[PDB]
Write a protein that binds this ligand. Structure first.
Ligand SMILES: OC[C@H]1O[C@H](OC[C@H]2O[C@H](OC[C@H]3O[C@H](O)[C@@H](O)[C@@H](O)[C@@H]3O)[C@@H](O)[C@@H](O[C@H]3O[C@H](CO)[C@@H](O)[C@H](O)[C@@H]3O)[C@@H]2O)[C@@H](O)[C@@H](O)[C@@H]1O
Ligand SMILES: [Ca+2]
Ligand SMILES: [Ca+2]
Ligand SMILES: [Ca+2]
Length: 132
């Protein structure tokens, strides 16, 4: 037994899958469900710092489970949870700008950016880590 599956990353009781292939946002949601996970929902500040560092180093635009598709301007996580005011400090400068209609969030550089949901990007899945 292993806390996390092969190629996954462990951090604070959860396993994260950093994809090596690309998908649009909706298909990323499905990809995660197919492996018993969810497109990453950041539930804490320590988690954000950890993920941002890995994403920045990967130098890849990467989807997270956050969108304002249902109501422009109101960002909600895929589990139905609302984005908190304390997490809003993570957007890059000038973001979110909804330029050309951007309703999905991605890790970009050292922060977050909103981009077109139909764009294919890497993604991160999250599921709980097993204890053995
Ligand atoms: O600090 C520097 C900067 O470095 C990284 O890249 C910056 C740049 O990345 C994205 O554009 C990439 C290319 O996209 C097309 O191929 C061309 O436009 C080409 O000229 C670009 O280089 C993109 O995220 C961009 O952000 C702007 O566009 C997006 C998409 O329309 C929009 O959502 C943003 O609000 C903004 O207008 C970004 O500047 C990244 O690590 C950056 O985070 C970093 O700041
Ligand atoms: Ca919109
Ligand atoms: Ca939007
Ligand atoms: Ca943007």
């Amino acid at each position: 037994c292993h806390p996390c599956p092969w190629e996954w990353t462990f951090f604070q009781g959860n396993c994260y899958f950093m994809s090596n292939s690309q998908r649009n946002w909706h298909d990323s949601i499905t990809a995660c469900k197919e492996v018993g996970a969810q497109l990453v929902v950041i539930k804490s500040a320590e988690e954000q710092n950890f993920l941002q560092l890995q994403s920045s180093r990967s130098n890849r635009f990467t989807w997270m489970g956050l969108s304002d598709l249902n109501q422009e301007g109101t960002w909600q996580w895929v589990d139905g949870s609302p984005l908190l005011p304390s997490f809003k400090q993570y957007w890059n400068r000038g973001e979110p700008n909804n330029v050309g209609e951007e309703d999905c969030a991605e890790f970009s550089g050292n922060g977050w950016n909103d981009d077109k949901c139909n764009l294919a990007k890497f993604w991160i899945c999250k599921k709980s880590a097993a204890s053995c």
